[PDB]
DNA sequence: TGTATGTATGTATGTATGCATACATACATACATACA
């Protein structure tokens, strides 16, 4: 299959997925997300030490970039949230 | 006290395999811990 053919098959696949999600009830949505959670729990509890260390390292790097791309309003709101949460814990 | 840094949990998105099923990835949300 060519690079072009693959892209057209996958565009269609993505469109059917989009339709199916847009047709879900809120109950179907929440059942889907519960299964996603379980699948992820199950992957994590059998993770090796090394796989864990790689996952955290990537997570700490996704976080760095995300922070670095934040607008000034987003930064500011993030600091407010942390500052209010710290204040609550102190008091 | 407040912000930088780390991570437990959750999910939007894409797709390999049998349009739906059933994962799998990338990345966010939300708090927690380290540190100035």
PDB file of C-alpha atoms (C1' of nucleotides) in Angstrom:
ATOM      1  CA  UNK A   1       0.000   0.000   0.000  1.00  0.00           C
ATOM      2  CA  UNK A   2       1.374   3.494  -0.792  1.00  0.00           C
ATOM      3  CA  UNK A   3       1.934   6.357   1.580  1.00  0.00           C
ATOM      4  CA  UNK A   4      -0.974   8.081  -0.088  1.00  0.00           C
ATOM      5  CA  UNK A   5      -3.303   4.985   0.048  1.00  0.00           C
ATOM      6  CA  UNK A   6      -2.581   4.422   3.695  1.00  0.00           C
ATOM      7  CA  UNK A   7      -3.365   8.026   4.528  1.00  0.00           C
ATOM      8  CA  UNK A   8      -6.822   7.767   2.796  1.00  0.00           C
ATOM      9  CA  UNK A   9      -7.722   4.533   4.482  1.00  0.00           C
ATOM     10  CA  UNK A  10      -6.792   6.096   7.856  1.00  0.00           C
ATOM     11  CA  UNK A  11      -8.660   9.288   7.192  1.00  0.00           C
ATOM     12  CA  UNK A  12     -11.831   7.215   6.665  1.00  0.00           C
ATOM     13  CA  UNK A  13     -11.100   5.183   9.747  1.00  0.00           C
ATOM     14  CA  UNK A  14     -10.754   8.434  11.730  1.00  0.00           C
ATOM     15  CA  UNK A  15     -13.987   9.750  10.337  1.00  0.00           C
ATOM     16  CA  UNK A  16     -15.953   6.613  11.401  1.00  0.00           C
ATOM     17  CA  UNK A  17     -14.366   6.864  14.829  1.00  0.00           C
ATOM     18  CA  UNK A  18     -15.425  10.533  15.006  1.00  0.00           C
ATOM     19  CA  UNK A  19     -19.010   9.581  14.096  1.00  0.00           C
ATOM     20  CA  UNK A  20     -19.171   6.797  16.587  1.00  0.00           C
ATOM     21  CA  UNK A  21     -17.920   9.027  19.372  1.00  0.00           C
ATOM     22  CA  UNK A  22     -20.274  11.803  18.464  1.00  0.00           C
ATOM     23  CA  UNK A  23     -23.113   9.224  18.668  1.00  0.00           C
ATOM     24  CA  UNK A  24     -22.186   7.883  22.098  1.00  0.00           C
ATOM     25  CA  UNK A  25     -24.486   8.586  25.024  1.00  0.00           C
ATOM     26  CA  UNK A  26     -22.923  10.050  28.158  1.00  0.00           C
ATOM     27  CA  UNK A  27     -23.224   6.539  29.637  1.00  0.00           C
ATOM     28  CA  UNK A  28     -21.435   4.937  26.719  1.00  0.00           C
ATOM     29  CA  UNK A  29     -18.755   7.634  26.952  1.00  0.00           C
ATOM     30  CA  UNK A  30     -18.225   7.003  30.691  1.00  0.00           C
ATOM     31  CA  UNK A  31     -18.130   3.184  30.210  1.00  0.00           C
ATOM     32  CA  UNK A  32     -15.532   3.655  27.445  1.00  0.00           C
ATOM     33  CA  UNK A  33     -13.363   5.855  29.666  1.00  0.00           C
ATOM     34  CA  UNK A  34     -13.670   3.418  32.590  1.00  0.00           C
ATOM     35  CA  UNK A  35     -12.217   0.669  30.351  1.00  0.00           C
ATOM     36  CA  UNK A  36      -9.436   2.949  29.219  1.00  0.00           C
ATOM     37  CA  UNK A  37      -8.565   3.547  32.839  1.00  0.00           C
ATOM     38  CA  UNK A  38      -8.483  -0.091  33.592  1.00  0.00           C
ATOM     39  CA  UNK A  39      -6.366  -0.898  30.612  1.00  0.00           C
ATOM     40  CA  UNK A  40      -3.854   1.770  31.709  1.00  0.00           C
ATOM     41  CA  UNK A  41      -3.882   0.520  35.384  1.00  0.00           C
ATOM     42  CA  UNK A  42      -3.115  -2.977  34.142  1.00  0.00           C
ATOM     43  CA  UNK A  43      -0.192  -1.809  31.945  1.00  0.00           C
ATOM     44  CA  UNK A  44       1.255   0.109  34.950  1.00  0.00           C
ATOM     45  CA  UNK A  45       1.081  -2.646  37.510  1.00  0.00           C
ATOM     46  CA  UNK A  46       3.221  -4.975  35.349  1.00  0.00           C
ATOM     47  CA  UNK A  47       5.660  -2.335  34.219  1.00  0.00           C
ATOM     48  CA  UNK A  48       9.342  -3.195  34.850  1.00  0.00           C
ATOM     49  CA  UNK A  49      11.485  -0.863  36.913  1.00  0.00           C
ATOM     50  CA  UNK A  50      13.203   0.316  33.723  1.00  0.00           C
ATOM     51  CA  UNK A  51       9.957   0.893  31.829  1.00  0.00           C
ATOM     52  CA  UNK A  52       8.782   2.930  34.735  1.00  0.00           C
ATOM     53  CA  UNK A  53      11.904   5.027  34.773  1.00  0.00           C
ATOM     54  CA  UNK A  54      11.558   5.732  31.014  1.00  0.00           C
ATOM     55  CA  UNK A  55       7.876   6.614  31.389  1.00  0.00           C
ATOM     56  CA  UNK A  56       8.618   9.120  34.208  1.00  0.00           C
ATOM     57  CA  UNK A  57      11.540  10.587  32.338  1.00  0.00           C
ATOM     58  CA  UNK A  58       9.276  11.203  29.343  1.00  0.00           C
ATOM     59  CA  UNK A  59       6.526  12.580  31.465  1.00  0.00           C
ATOM     60  CA  UNK A  60       8.927  15.079  33.112  1.00  0.00           C
ATOM     61  CA  UNK A  61      10.025  16.149  29.677  1.00  0.00           C
ATOM     62  CA  UNK A  62       6.523  16.471  28.258  1.00  0.00           C
ATOM     63  CA  UNK A  63       5.855  18.653  31.251  1.00  0.00           C
ATOM     64  CA  UNK A  64       8.900  20.890  30.601  1.00  0.00           C
ATOM     65  CA  UNK A  65       7.946  21.612  27.043  1.00  0.00           C
ATOM     66  CA  UNK A  66       4.291  22.177  27.992  1.00  0.00           C
ATOM     67  CA  UNK A  67       5.333  24.744  30.542  1.00  0.00           C
ATOM     68  CA  UNK A  68       7.615  26.385  28.124  1.00  0.00           C
ATOM     69  CA  UNK A  69       4.892  26.778  25.537  1.00  0.00           C
ATOM     70  CA  UNK A  70       2.372  28.360  27.918  1.00  0.00           C
ATOM     71  CA  UNK A  71       1.086  31.894  27.350  1.00  0.00           C
ATOM     72  CA  UNK A  72       1.521  34.493  30.024  1.00  0.00           C
ATOM     73  CA  UNK A  73      -2.103  34.193  31.047  1.00  0.00           C
ATOM     74  CA  UNK A  74      -1.709  30.403  31.381  1.00  0.00           C
ATOM     75  CA  UNK A  75       1.430  30.650  33.432  1.00  0.00           C
ATOM     76  CA  UNK A  76      -0.157  33.157  35.681  1.00  0.00           C
ATOM     77  CA  UNK A  77      -3.304  31.080  36.262  1.00  0.00           C
ATOM     78  CA  UNK A  78      -1.096  28.034  36.986  1.00  0.00           C
ATOM     79  CA  UNK A  79       0.823  29.961  39.700  1.00  0.00           C
ATOM     80  CA  UNK A  80      -2.378  31.193  41.238  1.00  0.00           C
ATOM     81  CA  UNK A  81      -3.665  27.647  41.457  1.00  0.00           C
ATOM     82  CA  UNK A  82      -0.486  26.387  43.117  1.00  0.00           C
ATOM     83  CA  UNK A  83      -0.294  29.334  45.445  1.00  0.00           C
ATOM     84  CA  UNK A  84      -3.892  28.834  46.591  1.00  0.00           C
ATOM     85  CA  UNK A  85      -3.376  25.109  47.068  1.00  0.00           C
ATOM     86  CA  UNK A  86      -0.184  25.702  49.089  1.00  0.00           C
ATOM     87  CA  UNK A  87      -2.001  28.315  51.195  1.00  0.00           C
ATOM     88  CA  UNK A  88      -4.736  25.851  51.963  1.00  0.00           C
ATOM     89  CA  UNK A  89      -2.296  23.218  53.122  1.00  0.00           C
ATOM     90  CA  UNK A  90      -0.348  25.583  55.338  1.00  0.00           C
ATOM     91  CA  UNK A  91      -3.602  26.830  57.035  1.00  0.00           C
TER      92      UNK A  91
ATOM     93  C1'  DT B   1       5.294  31.510  51.400  1.00  0.00           C
ATOM     94  C1'  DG B   2       5.433  30.746  46.798  1.00  0.00           C
ATOM     95  C1'  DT B   3       7.210  28.523  42.595  1.00  0.00           C
ATOM     96  C1'  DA B   4       9.973  24.822  40.207  1.00  0.00           C
ATOM     97  C1'  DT B   5       9.936  20.141  39.603  1.00  0.00           C
ATOM     98  C1'  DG B   6       7.968  15.349  39.788  1.00  0.00           C
ATOM     99  C1'  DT B   7       4.420  12.075  39.062  1.00  0.00           C
ATOM    100  C1'  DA B   8      -0.309   9.269  39.918  1.00  0.00           C
ATOM    101  C1'  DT B   9      -4.157   9.222  37.390  1.00  0.00           C
ATOM    102  C1'  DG B  10      -7.036  10.052  33.436  1.00  0.00           C
ATOM    103  C1'  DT B  11      -8.269  10.528  28.363  1.00  0.00           C
ATOM    104  C1'  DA B  12      -8.232  12.413  23.278  1.00  0.00           C
ATOM    105  C1'  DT B  13      -6.645  10.557  19.420  1.00  0.00           C
ATOM    106  C1'  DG B  14      -5.081   7.304  16.006  1.00  0.00           C
ATOM    107  C1'  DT B  15      -5.011   2.692  14.119  1.00  0.00           C
ATOM    108  C1'  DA B  16      -3.899  -2.630  13.653  1.00  0.00           C
ATOM    109  C1'  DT B  17      -6.949  -6.323  13.349  1.00  0.00           C
ATOM    110  C1'  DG B  18     -11.602  -8.620  13.113  1.00  0.00           C
ATOM    111  C1'  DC B  19     -17.414  -0.224   9.675  1.00  0.00           C
ATOM    112  C1'  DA B  20     -16.452  -2.056  14.820  1.00  0.00           C
ATOM    113  C1'  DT B  21     -13.421  -3.920  18.215  1.00  0.00           C
ATOM    114  C1'  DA B  22     -10.135  -3.384  21.139  1.00  0.00           C
ATOM    115  C1'  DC B  23      -6.154  -1.782  21.997  1.00  0.00           C
ATOM    116  C1'  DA B  24      -1.864   1.571  22.108  1.00  0.00           C
ATOM    117  C1'  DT B  25       0.263   6.024  22.107  1.00  0.00           C
ATOM    118  C1'  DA B  26       0.968  10.646  23.468  1.00  0.00           C
ATOM    119  C1'  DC B  27      -0.020  13.890  26.306  1.00  0.00           C
ATOM    120  C1'  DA B  28      -3.085  16.527  29.832  1.00  0.00           C
ATOM    121  C1'  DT B  29      -5.012  17.272  34.504  1.00  0.00           C
ATOM    122  C1'  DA B  30      -4.340  17.711  39.003  1.00  0.00           C
ATOM    123  C1'  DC B  31      -2.022  17.380  42.792  1.00  0.00           C
ATOM    124  C1'  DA B  32       2.295  16.510  45.582  1.00  0.00           C
ATOM    125  C1'  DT B  33       7.040  17.142  46.773  1.00  0.00           C
ATOM    126  C1'  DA B  34      11.474  19.726  46.608  1.00  0.00           C
ATOM    127  C1'  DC B  35      13.455  23.848  47.060  1.00  0.00           C
ATOM    128  C1'  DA B  36      14.635  29.056  46.926  1.00  0.00           C
TER     129       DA B  36
END
